[PDB]
Design an enzyme around this catalytic site. Sequence first.
Site, short mmCIF file in Angstrom:
data_model
loop_
_atom_site.label_atom_id
_atom_site.label_comp_id
_atom_site.label_asym_id
_atom_site.label_seq_id
_atom_site.Cartn_x
_atom_site.Cartn_y
_atom_site.Cartn_z
N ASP A 44 -1.72 5.71 -5.60
CA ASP A 44 -2.01 5.17 -4.93
C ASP A 44 -2.41 2.65 -5.00
OD1 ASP A 44 -2.83 3.97 -2.14
OD2 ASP A 44 -4.83 4.57 -1.79
N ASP A 93 0.87 -0.94 0.09
CA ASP A 93 -0.31 -0.58 -0.46
C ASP A 93 1.00 1.59 0.32
OD1 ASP A 93 -2.43 1.13 0.30
OD2 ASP A 93 -2.08 1.26 2.43
C1 13W Z 1 -7.50 3.88 0.30
N1 13W Z 1 -7.19 3.29 1.57
C2 13W Z 1 -5.09 3.02 1.84
N2 13W Z 1 -4.21 3.45 0.39
N3 13W Z 1 -5.09 2.24 2.56
C3 13W Z 1 -5.50 1.83 3.32
C4 13W Z 1 -4.67 1.91 4.75
C5 13W Z 1 -6.28 0.89 3.08
C6 13W Z 1 -6.88 -0.12 2.55
C7 13W Z 1 -7.14 -1.10 2.39
C8 13W Z 1 -7.89 -2.21 1.29
C9 13W Z 1 -8.46 -3.46 1.35
C10 13W Z 1 -8.71 -4.39 1.13
C11 13W Z 1 -8.28 -3.58 -0.97
C12 13W Z 1 -7.41 -2.97 -1.04
C13 13W Z 1 -6.89 -1.99 -2.47
N4 13W Z 1 -7.23 -2.31 -3.51
C14 13W Z 1 -7.17 -1.44 0.09
C15 13W Z 1 -8.24 -1.23 4.05
S1 13W Z 1 -7.48 -0.05 4.66
C16 13W Z 1 -6.55 3.12 3.63
C17 13W Z 1 -7.17 4.01 2.63
O1 13W Z 1 -8.44 4.25 2.86
#
Ligand code: 13W
Length: 390
Positions: free
Chosen positions: A232, A36
Amino acid sequence: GSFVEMVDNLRGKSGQGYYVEMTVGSPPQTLNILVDTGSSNFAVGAAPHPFLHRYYQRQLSSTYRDLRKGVYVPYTQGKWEGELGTDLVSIPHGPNVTVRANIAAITESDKFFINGSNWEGILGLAYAEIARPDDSLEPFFDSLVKQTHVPNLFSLQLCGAGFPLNQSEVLASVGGSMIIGGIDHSLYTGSLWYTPIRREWYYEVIIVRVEINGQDLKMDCKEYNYDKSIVDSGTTNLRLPKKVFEAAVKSIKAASSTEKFPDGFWLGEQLVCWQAGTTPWNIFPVISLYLMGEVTNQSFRITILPQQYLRPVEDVATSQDDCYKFAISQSSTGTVMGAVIMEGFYVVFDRARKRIGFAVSACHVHDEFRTAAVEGPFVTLDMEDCGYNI
Ligand SMILES: CN1C(=N)N[C@](C)(c2cc(-c3cccc(C#N)c3)cs2)CC1=O
Protein backbone atom coordinates in the site's frame (compact mmCIF):
# COMPACT_ATOMS: atom_id res chain seq x y z
CA GLY A 1 14.57 3.50 -19.42
CA SER A 2 11.89 3.34 -22.08
CA PHE A 3 9.36 5.63 -20.39
CA VAL A 4 11.13 8.98 -20.02
CA GLU A 5 7.87 10.95 -20.17
CA MET A 6 6.76 9.29 -16.93
CA VAL A 7 10.07 9.02 -15.07
CA ASP A 8 10.24 11.45 -12.12
CA ASN A 9 6.54 12.37 -12.29
CA LEU A 10 5.85 12.01 -8.55
CA ARG A 11 6.34 14.43 -5.66
CA GLY A 12 5.91 14.08 -1.90
CA LYS A 13 7.31 11.99 0.96
CA SER A 14 6.27 8.95 3.05
CA GLY A 15 4.66 11.00 5.81
CA GLN A 16 2.49 13.02 3.41
CA GLY A 17 2.11 10.43 0.65
CA TYR A 18 3.25 10.67 -2.98
CA TYR A 19 1.20 12.37 -5.70
CA VAL A 20 1.04 12.67 -9.48
CA GLU A 21 -0.43 15.52 -11.51
CA MET A 22 -3.71 14.81 -13.31
CA THR A 23 -6.31 16.83 -15.17
CA VAL A 24 -10.09 16.46 -15.04
CA GLY A 25 -12.79 18.06 -17.18
CA SER A 26 -12.94 20.17 -20.33
CA PRO A 27 -11.12 22.47 -20.45
CA PRO A 28 -8.65 20.53 -18.25
CA GLN A 29 -8.46 21.37 -14.54
CA THR A 30 -5.10 20.45 -13.02
CA LEU A 31 -4.99 18.69 -9.63
CA ASN A 32 -2.36 16.85 -7.59
CA ILE A 33 -3.50 13.34 -6.83
CA LEU A 34 -2.24 10.91 -4.20
CA VAL A 35 -1.13 7.58 -5.68
CA ASP A 36 -2.82 4.93 -3.52
CA THR A 37 -2.55 1.19 -4.16
CA GLY A 38 -4.55 0.65 -0.96
CA SER A 39 -7.94 1.86 -2.24
CA SER A 40 -9.98 1.89 -5.44
CA ASN A 41 -11.81 5.20 -5.80
CA PHE A 42 -10.72 8.26 -7.78
CA ALA A 43 -11.94 11.06 -5.50
CA VAL A 44 -11.13 14.75 -5.66
CA GLY A 45 -11.98 17.79 -3.57
CA ALA A 46 -14.88 19.48 -5.38
CA ALA A 47 -15.74 22.28 -2.96
CA PRO A 48 -13.81 25.01 -1.12
CA HIS A 49 -11.79 23.84 1.87
CA PRO A 50 -9.30 25.63 4.18
CA PHE A 51 -6.50 23.21 3.25
CA LEU A 52 -7.10 23.21 -0.52
CA HIS A 53 -6.05 26.05 -2.81
CA ARG A 54 -7.86 24.50 -5.77
CA TYR A 55 -10.54 21.92 -6.46
CA TYR A 56 -12.68 20.29 -9.15
CA GLN A 57 -15.37 22.66 -10.44
CA ARG A 58 -17.91 20.48 -12.21
CA GLN A 59 -19.91 23.45 -13.50
CA LEU A 60 -16.88 24.57 -15.55
CA SER A 61 -16.45 21.23 -17.33
CA SER A 62 -18.48 20.72 -20.49
CA THR A 63 -17.80 16.97 -20.37
CA TYR A 64 -18.96 16.47 -16.78
CA ARG A 65 -21.71 13.86 -16.35
CA ASP A 66 -23.75 13.59 -13.14
CA LEU A 67 -24.38 10.02 -11.95
CA ARG A 68 -27.00 11.32 -9.48
CA LYS A 69 -25.69 9.25 -6.60
CA GLY A 70 -23.90 10.08 -3.39
CA VAL A 71 -21.10 8.15 -1.73
CA TYR A 72 -20.05 8.08 1.92
CA VAL A 73 -16.53 6.93 2.72
CA PRO A 74 -15.44 6.64 6.37
CA TYR A 75 -11.85 5.69 7.26
CA THR A 76 -10.20 4.72 10.56
CA GLN A 77 -9.46 8.41 11.00
CA GLY A 78 -11.19 10.83 8.69
CA LYS A 79 -14.01 10.51 6.20
CA TRP A 80 -15.62 12.30 3.30
CA GLU A 81 -18.91 12.54 1.49
CA GLY A 82 -19.15 13.05 -2.24
CA GLU A 83 -21.22 13.01 -5.40
CA LEU A 84 -20.51 10.49 -8.14
CA GLY A 85 -20.04 11.45 -11.78
CA THR A 86 -17.77 10.94 -14.79
CA ASP A 87 -15.49 13.21 -16.80
CA LEU A 88 -12.48 13.11 -19.13
CA VAL A 89 -9.26 12.46 -17.21
CA SER A 90 -5.60 12.64 -18.24
CA ILE A 91 -2.16 12.35 -16.69
CA PRO A 92 0.15 15.02 -18.19
CA HIS A 93 3.32 13.11 -17.37
CA GLY A 94 1.84 9.77 -18.30
CA PRO A 95 0.46 7.86 -21.27
CA ASN A 96 -0.72 10.24 -23.97
CA VAL A 97 -4.36 9.22 -23.71
CA THR A 98 -7.54 10.71 -22.28
CA VAL A 99 -10.24 8.55 -20.74
CA ARG A 100 -13.71 8.85 -19.29
CA ALA A 101 -13.54 7.78 -15.67
CA ASN A 102 -15.67 7.79 -12.56
CA ILE A 103 -14.96 10.65 -10.19
CA ALA A 104 -16.18 11.03 -6.63
CA ALA A 105 -16.54 14.79 -6.16
CA ILE A 106 -15.83 15.41 -2.48
CA THR A 107 -18.26 17.99 -1.10
CA GLU A 108 -17.89 17.34 2.63
CA SER A 109 -14.97 15.92 4.61
CA ASP A 110 -13.52 15.50 8.09
CA LYS A 111 -9.79 15.09 8.78
CA PHE A 112 -9.17 13.92 5.20
CA PHE A 113 -7.31 16.84 3.60
CA ILE A 114 -4.06 17.64 5.39
CA ASN A 115 -2.95 21.18 6.19
CA GLY A 116 0.40 21.74 4.50
CA SER A 117 -0.01 18.89 2.03
CA ASN A 118 -0.14 19.59 -1.70
CA TRP A 119 -2.58 16.95 -2.97
CA GLU A 120 -6.23 17.62 -3.77
CA GLY A 121 -7.49 14.10 -4.39
CA ILE A 122 -6.64 10.40 -4.30
CA LEU A 123 -6.21 7.85 -7.07
CA GLY A 124 -7.24 4.42 -5.83
CA LEU A 125 -5.28 1.92 -7.90
CA ALA A 126 -6.55 -1.30 -6.31
CA TYR A 127 -9.45 -3.45 -7.59
CA ALA A 128 -13.21 -2.96 -7.93
CA GLU A 129 -13.99 -5.37 -5.09
CA ILE A 130 -13.09 -2.67 -2.57
CA ALA A 131 -14.45 0.36 -4.41
CA ARG A 132 -17.19 2.40 -2.71
CA PRO A 133 -20.16 2.23 -2.73
CA ASP A 134 -19.72 -1.17 -4.37
CA ASP A 135 -17.83 -3.04 -7.09
CA SER A 136 -20.03 -1.57 -9.83
CA LEU A 137 -18.07 1.70 -9.75
CA GLU A 138 -15.26 0.94 -12.20
CA PRO A 139 -11.85 2.10 -10.83
CA PHE A 140 -9.71 4.49 -12.86
CA PHE A 141 -7.10 1.96 -13.98
CA ASP A 142 -9.78 -0.44 -15.20
CA SER A 143 -11.29 2.34 -17.32
CA LEU A 144 -7.86 3.30 -18.65
CA VAL A 145 -7.08 -0.24 -19.77
CA LYS A 146 -10.54 -0.87 -21.20
CA GLN A 147 -10.59 2.39 -23.18
CA THR A 148 -7.01 2.45 -24.53
CA HIS A 149 -4.13 0.20 -25.60
CA VAL A 150 -2.23 0.81 -22.36
CA PRO A 151 -0.91 -2.52 -20.97
CA ASN A 152 -2.62 -3.70 -17.77
CA LEU A 153 0.35 -2.94 -15.51
CA PHE A 154 1.93 -0.04 -13.65
CA SER A 155 5.08 0.32 -11.58
CA LEU A 156 6.06 2.60 -8.72
CA GLN A 157 9.38 3.97 -7.56
CA LEU A 158 8.82 6.00 -4.36
CA CYS A 159 11.91 7.96 -3.39
CA GLY A 160 12.57 8.89 0.23
CA ALA A 161 15.15 11.67 0.45
CA GLY A 162 16.94 10.23 3.46
CA PHE A 163 16.64 13.59 5.20
CA PRO A 164 13.87 16.12 6.00
CA LEU A 165 12.44 18.19 3.16
CA ASN A 166 11.06 21.58 4.17
CA GLN A 167 7.91 23.13 2.70
CA SER A 168 9.80 24.62 -0.28
CA GLU A 169 12.07 21.64 -0.87
CA VAL A 170 9.32 19.02 -0.91
CA LEU A 171 7.63 21.08 -3.62
CA ALA A 172 10.74 21.30 -5.80
CA SER A 173 12.05 17.77 -5.21
CA VAL A 174 11.45 14.69 -7.37
CA GLY A 175 9.60 12.17 -5.23
CA GLY A 176 9.66 9.22 -7.59
CA SER A 177 8.03 7.67 -10.63
CA MET A 178 4.75 6.07 -11.58
CA ILE A 179 5.16 4.29 -14.92
CA ILE A 180 1.73 3.59 -16.40
CA GLY A 181 1.71 0.57 -18.69
CA GLY A 182 5.30 -0.53 -18.32
CA ILE A 183 8.58 -1.19 -16.52
CA ASP A 184 11.40 1.36 -16.79
CA HIS A 185 14.79 -0.32 -16.32
CA SER A 186 16.54 2.88 -15.21
CA LEU A 187 14.61 2.80 -11.91
CA TYR A 188 16.17 -0.34 -10.45
CA THR A 189 19.31 -2.43 -10.28
CA GLY A 190 19.62 -6.19 -10.24
CA SER A 191 16.75 -8.54 -11.00
CA LEU A 192 13.01 -8.29 -10.52
CA TRP A 193 11.47 -11.05 -8.40
CA TYR A 194 7.73 -11.69 -8.52
CA THR A 195 5.29 -12.80 -5.86
CA PRO A 196 1.71 -13.82 -6.72
CA ILE A 197 -1.20 -11.48 -6.13
CA ARG A 198 -3.17 -13.83 -3.86
CA ARG A 199 -6.54 -12.28 -4.60
CA GLU A 200 -7.57 -9.21 -6.54
CA TRP A 201 -9.13 -6.75 -4.10
CA TYR A 202 -6.25 -5.07 -2.26
CA TYR A 203 -2.88 -5.98 -3.73
CA GLU A 204 -2.67 -8.98 -1.38
CA VAL A 205 0.50 -11.04 -1.04
CA ILE A 206 1.83 -13.78 1.23
CA ILE A 207 4.86 -13.43 3.52
CA VAL A 208 6.43 -16.80 4.37
CA ARG A 209 9.34 -15.94 6.68
CA VAL A 210 10.69 -12.90 8.49
CA GLU A 211 14.27 -12.26 9.66
CA ILE A 212 15.86 -9.51 11.74
CA ASN A 213 19.59 -9.38 10.88
CA GLY A 214 19.33 -12.94 9.55
CA GLN A 215 17.66 -14.27 12.70
CA ASP A 216 14.36 -16.04 12.03
CA LEU A 217 11.48 -14.40 13.90
CA LYS A 218 10.31 -18.03 14.00
CA MET A 219 6.56 -17.40 14.13
CA ASP A 220 3.83 -19.53 12.54
CA CYS A 221 3.90 -17.94 9.07
CA LYS A 222 0.12 -17.56 9.20
CA GLU A 223 0.71 -14.87 11.83
CA TYR A 224 2.55 -12.74 9.27
CA ASN A 225 -0.57 -12.60 7.08
CA TYR A 226 -3.26 -12.29 9.73
CA ASP A 227 -5.66 -11.33 8.45
CA LYS A 228 -3.99 -10.36 5.16
CA SER A 229 -0.77 -8.77 3.86
CA ILE A 230 -0.97 -5.96 1.30
CA VAL A 231 1.28 -3.54 -0.63
CA ASP A 232 0.00 0.00 0.00
CA SER A 233 1.58 3.21 -1.28
CA GLY A 234 -1.11 5.01 0.74
CA THR A 235 0.33 3.94 4.10
CA THR A 236 3.49 5.53 5.52
CA ASN A 237 4.69 2.73 7.78
CA LEU A 238 5.48 -0.92 7.54
CA ARG A 239 2.54 -2.12 9.64
CA LEU A 240 2.54 -5.57 11.24
CA PRO A 241 -0.12 -7.68 13.01
CA LYS A 242 -0.04 -7.09 16.78
CA LYS A 243 1.78 -10.31 17.69
CA VAL A 244 4.28 -9.99 14.85
CA PHE A 245 4.91 -6.35 15.75
CA GLU A 246 5.59 -7.29 19.37
CA ALA A 247 8.06 -10.03 18.34
CA ALA A 248 9.74 -7.82 15.73
CA VAL A 249 10.18 -4.91 18.14
CA LYS A 250 11.64 -7.21 20.77
CA SER A 251 14.17 -8.49 18.22
CA ILE A 252 14.98 -5.02 16.84
CA LYS A 253 15.46 -3.81 20.43
CA ALA A 254 17.82 -6.70 21.13
CA ALA A 255 19.83 -6.09 17.95
CA SER A 256 20.21 -2.37 18.78
CA SER A 257 20.74 -2.89 22.52
CA THR A 258 23.99 -0.90 22.68
CA GLU A 259 21.73 2.16 22.78
CA LYS A 260 18.53 2.46 24.82
CA PHE A 261 15.53 4.25 23.32
CA PRO A 262 12.41 5.43 25.18
CA ASP A 263 9.14 3.50 24.87
CA GLY A 264 7.71 6.48 23.01
CA PHE A 265 10.24 5.92 20.21
CA TRP A 266 9.24 2.31 19.67
CA LEU A 267 5.60 3.40 19.71
CA GLY A 268 6.32 5.69 16.77
CA GLU A 269 5.28 8.66 18.90
CA GLN A 270 8.52 10.45 19.68
CA LEU A 271 11.57 11.16 17.59
CA VAL A 272 15.17 10.38 18.40
CA CYS A 273 18.02 12.62 17.34
CA TRP A 274 21.76 12.39 16.86
CA GLN A 275 24.42 15.01 16.20
CA ALA A 276 24.52 15.81 12.47
CA GLY A 277 25.95 12.92 10.47
CA THR A 278 26.38 10.53 13.40
CA THR A 279 23.20 8.43 13.12
CA PRO A 280 24.37 4.93 14.19
CA TRP A 281 22.84 3.06 11.27
CA ASN A 282 25.07 0.05 11.96
CA ILE A 283 23.56 -0.74 15.36
CA PHE A 284 20.10 -1.20 13.81
CA PRO A 285 19.32 -4.49 12.02
CA VAL A 286 18.25 -5.09 8.45
CA ILE A 287 14.79 -6.65 8.07
CA SER A 288 14.03 -9.36 5.52
CA LEU A 289 10.57 -10.36 4.36
CA TYR A 290 10.39 -13.61 2.37
CA LEU A 291 7.57 -13.69 -0.16
CA MET A 292 5.98 -16.64 -1.96
CA GLY A 293 7.60 -17.06 -5.38
CA GLU A 294 5.99 -17.88 -8.72
CA VAL A 295 7.47 -21.39 -8.78
CA THR A 296 6.20 -24.16 -6.49
CA ASN A 297 8.04 -24.32 -3.14
CA GLN A 298 10.18 -21.33 -4.10
CA SER A 299 10.42 -17.96 -2.33
CA PHE A 300 12.59 -14.85 -2.48
CA ARG A 301 13.39 -12.13 0.03
CA ILE A 302 13.40 -8.35 0.10
CA THR A 303 15.66 -6.73 2.68
CA ILE A 304 15.37 -3.19 3.98
CA LEU A 305 17.70 -1.09 6.09
CA PRO A 306 17.08 1.22 9.03
CA GLN A 307 17.47 3.98 6.42
CA GLN A 308 14.06 2.78 5.25
CA TYR A 309 12.34 2.11 8.58
CA LEU A 310 13.63 5.19 10.46
CA ARG A 311 11.68 8.09 8.88
CA PRO A 312 13.57 11.41 8.75
CA VAL A 313 11.74 14.22 10.55
CA GLU A 314 12.61 17.83 11.30
CA ASP A 315 13.61 18.44 14.90
CA VAL A 316 11.23 20.48 17.06
CA ALA A 317 14.06 23.00 17.48
CA THR A 318 14.94 22.80 13.76
CA SER A 319 18.47 22.14 15.06
CA GLN A 320 21.29 20.68 12.99
CA ASP A 321 20.68 17.23 14.44
CA ASP A 322 19.49 14.36 12.25
CA CYS A 323 16.23 13.06 13.70
CA TYR A 324 13.85 10.19 12.93
CA LYS A 325 10.68 8.43 13.99
CA PHE A 326 10.39 4.64 14.12
CA ALA A 327 8.22 3.78 11.12
CA ILE A 328 7.14 0.25 11.99
CA SER A 329 3.82 0.03 13.84
CA GLN A 330 1.14 -2.43 14.84
CA SER A 331 -1.98 -3.22 12.87
CA SER A 332 -5.24 -4.98 13.69
CA THR A 333 -5.95 -5.40 9.97
CA GLY A 334 -2.96 -7.40 8.75
CA THR A 335 0.46 -6.53 7.38
CA VAL A 336 0.76 -3.34 5.37
CA MET A 337 3.86 -2.85 3.27
CA GLY A 338 3.72 0.94 3.13
CA ALA A 339 6.10 3.64 1.95
CA VAL A 340 8.73 2.25 4.37
CA ILE A 341 9.00 -0.89 2.28
CA MET A 342 8.27 0.72 -1.07
CA GLU A 343 11.01 3.35 -0.78
CA GLY A 344 13.58 0.57 -0.85
CA PHE A 345 12.25 -1.01 -4.04
CA TYR A 346 10.93 -0.48 -7.52
CA VAL A 347 7.55 -2.23 -7.34
CA VAL A 348 5.79 -3.63 -10.40
CA PHE A 349 2.04 -4.12 -10.14
CA ASP A 350 1.63 -6.65 -12.96
CA ARG A 351 -2.15 -6.89 -13.03
CA ALA A 352 -2.08 -8.72 -16.37
CA ARG A 353 -0.09 -11.59 -14.85
CA LYS A 354 -1.58 -11.31 -11.35
CA ARG A 355 1.81 -10.70 -9.75
CA ILE A 356 3.86 -8.05 -7.98
CA GLY A 357 7.55 -7.63 -8.78
CA PHE A 358 10.27 -6.23 -6.53
CA ALA A 359 13.74 -4.98 -7.41
CA VAL A 360 16.27 -2.87 -5.52
CA SER A 361 15.38 0.78 -6.11
CA ALA A 362 17.87 3.03 -7.88
CA CYS A 363 16.83 5.70 -5.36
CA HIS A 364 16.87 3.83 -2.05
CA VAL A 365 18.83 5.42 0.78
CA HIS A 366 21.75 3.42 2.17
CA ASP A 367 25.32 3.73 3.47
CA GLU A 368 28.73 2.48 2.26
CA PHE A 369 28.38 -0.77 4.21
CA ARG A 370 24.87 -2.07 3.46
CA THR A 371 22.29 -1.88 0.70
CA ALA A 372 18.68 -2.95 0.34
CA ALA A 373 18.35 -6.26 -1.54
CA VAL A 374 16.01 -8.60 -3.44
CA GLU A 375 17.45 -12.11 -3.55
CA GLY A 376 16.44 -15.66 -4.38
CA PRO A 377 15.47 -18.32 -4.78
CA PHE A 378 14.99 -20.19 -1.51
CA VAL A 379 13.33 -23.54 -0.97
CA THR A 380 10.19 -22.98 1.11
CA LEU A 381 7.50 -25.60 1.79
CA ASP A 382 3.74 -25.36 2.44
CA MET A 383 3.62 -21.64 1.66
CA GLU A 384 -0.11 -21.90 0.93
CA ASP A 385 -0.54 -22.57 4.65
CA CYS A 386 0.83 -19.10 5.36
CA GLY A 387 -2.28 -17.50 3.90
CA TYR A 388 -5.13 -16.65 6.26
CA ASN A 389 -8.76 -17.71 5.83
CA ILE A 390 -11.69 -16.34 7.86
C1 13W B 1 -4.34 3.32 4.55
N1 13W B 1 -5.37 3.87 3.62
C2 13W B 1 -5.13 3.97 2.25
N2 13W B 1 -4.15 3.27 1.67
N3 13W B 1 -5.92 4.80 1.49
C3 13W B 1 -7.00 5.64 2.07
C4 13W B 1 -8.05 5.87 0.97
C5 13W B 1 -6.43 6.99 2.52
C6 13W B 1 -5.08 7.37 2.57
C7 13W B 1 -4.92 8.70 3.04
C8 13W B 1 -3.59 9.34 3.19
C9 13W B 1 -3.46 10.73 3.49
C10 13W B 1 -2.18 11.33 3.64
C11 13W B 1 -1.01 10.55 3.50
C12 13W B 1 -1.13 9.18 3.21
C13 13W B 1 0.05 8.35 3.06
N4 13W B 1 0.97 7.67 2.93
C14 13W B 1 -2.40 8.58 3.06
C15 13W B 1 -6.14 9.30 3.34
S1 13W B 1 -7.43 8.26 3.04
C16 13W B 1 -7.63 4.93 3.29
C17 13W B 1 -6.57 4.28 4.22
O1 13W B 1 -6.80 4.15 5.42
